[PDB]
Each structure stands twice: as structure tokens, then as C-alpha cells.
Amino acid sequence: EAIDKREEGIMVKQPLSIYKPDKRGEGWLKIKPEYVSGLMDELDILIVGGYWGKGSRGGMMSHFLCAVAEKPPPGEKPSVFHTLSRVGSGCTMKELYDLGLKLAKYWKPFHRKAPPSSILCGTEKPEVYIEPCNSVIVQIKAAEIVPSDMYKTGCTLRFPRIEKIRDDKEWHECMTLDDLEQLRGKASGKLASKHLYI
DNA sequence: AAACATTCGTTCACGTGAGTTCCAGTACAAGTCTGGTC
DNA sequence: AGACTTGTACTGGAACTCACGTGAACGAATGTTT
């Protein structure tokens, strides 16, 4: 019912539970479509930019800016991209280092005065831009789609998190802009639009 | 009187169960990095 | 919000050792039979 009502989950409480400040779970629990496996629709999209990390992840790429591809003419590959959102979490340290090494040599500095033709940005400009012909397809378990004025697509993902840097799929198998619009209109925002059967 | 068995009696090797030390794997709390909007 | 890293604790499995039990080789001594 919560999913059908476009809600954000449910909360379960024990009748005998007592109030204990600063306790992460003593009788109060939260059930959301994110936790259940398979209910959400994973979003696989390309990587078009990266940013330098801060703190422990100093000398490496900590977060990345991803873009969806447009609809090319029949028999032609997509050469135009629109930025969707930014992903910083979901990748382990070893996987993050491997991804950085895989694209360390292909990284190219980004200049605001001369934005790349292949990648078109909105208000957020990546520090380093990478051309699309050589990139990995990152999978993100987005919670919902909200209207964003900082990206060309006009929409962004709430609580984005990387799930896997897929290697089987190539750079040309990313989502299309029409596919993104269809997904947005499927449930008017929240991606969780599937019931649970057991 | 000699040979066999038998016996028999022993003892050694091998196998199974209980206690002790060490380390791999798992659960929980907190720090740390990162996402977006007004 | 979320996910990963760090720590802390906590436990169960593996390896080692010893005690108990058993099987069975065998070696020789003795008794019986021819």
C-alpha cells in the first residue's frame, strides 16, 4: 500500500519498546523498497566525468559524474550525452582503485571556457572529462527521480549509490534519453513501482 | 622322538573421543566520504 | 539519507595432544598326534 501510494516506506514498532536516546534499533525498524532485493529498477548509465577525492581518498577519483545517451539515427552510434547525476558511493576501495587505473591514462582536464562537444553539461562542470568511446557502464540503485536544474536532463537521482561497474556491457549499451523519460513517466517520480510476491 | 597346531599370550599399530590453543568469519557501533535541495 | 572502512567483541572450526579401546601380526612355548 505504501508503494502504491507513492510513500517512502513504513515503520514498525514494538508495544513494549522503551525510549532510549541514541539507539540505532531497539524495537523500531524501517521497511523500504530499497532494502528488498529486486523491487527497484537498476539504472545502468555511462561515466563522463570525475572529481578528485578528499581525505582518505586523496590521490584518486572518489566521485564521478554520469550522463545518459541520446537517441541516434538508425545504424549510427550515440555521440551526444546529457548529464544525469553524480555518484560518489557504492564502490569499494579496491574497485575504485581498479576503475581509476582503468581510466587514469584516458583522463582529460576539463576547461569551462571550452566544454567538450560530446559531453554537454548544465550547471555542474566535472573537473576531469572522459570521452564516451572508452568508459565503463555503472549501475546505480536510485531511490527516486526529482526535478533538477543543475543538469541538462533536468532530473536527478535521490540517494544515488553505485552497485556494480559492469564489464559485460559496452559503453554503447547505456540508457537512451527517451528511455529515461519513459522511466520518469512510468510512476511519476519514484522508481519503486513493483509489488512484492513471495 | 619329531612335527604341527594351537594357543595363547603378548605386545605394537591403528582408530576414535575429549580438552586446549590459535585463528577465520560474523555482528554491531562509530568514523568517514558522498549525494541533493532550499 | 546511504555505503564503506575501522574497531571491538564474540564465537566456532582446525590443529594438536593424550587416553581409551580394539584388531591383528607374530613369536615362541608347550601340548598333542603320528
From Swiss-Prot:
It comes from the Eukaryota. ATP binds at E8, K13, K30, K32. Residues 191-198 are annotated as: Required for catalytic activity. Testis, thymus, prostate and heart. Interacts with XRCC4; the LIG4-XRCC4 subcomplex has a 1:2 stoichiometry and XRCC4 is required for LIG4 stability. Component of the core long-range non-homologous end joining (NHEJ) complex (also named DNA-PK complex) composed of PRKDC, LIG4, XRCC4, XRCC6/Ku70, XRCC5/Ku86 and NHEJ1/XLF. Additional component of the NHEJ complex includes PAXX. Following autophosphorylation, PRKDC dissociates from DNA, leading to formation of the short-range NHEJ complex, composed of LIG4, XRCC4, XRCC6/Ku70, XRCC5/Ku86 and NHEJ1/XLF. Interacts with DCLRE1C; the interaction is direct. Interacts with APLF. It is linked to LIG4 syndrome: Characterized by immunodeficiency and developmental and growth delay. Patients display unusual facial features, microcephaly, growth and/or developmental delay, pancytopenia, and various skin abnormalities. This is DNA ligase 4. It comes from Homo sapiens. The gene is LIG4.
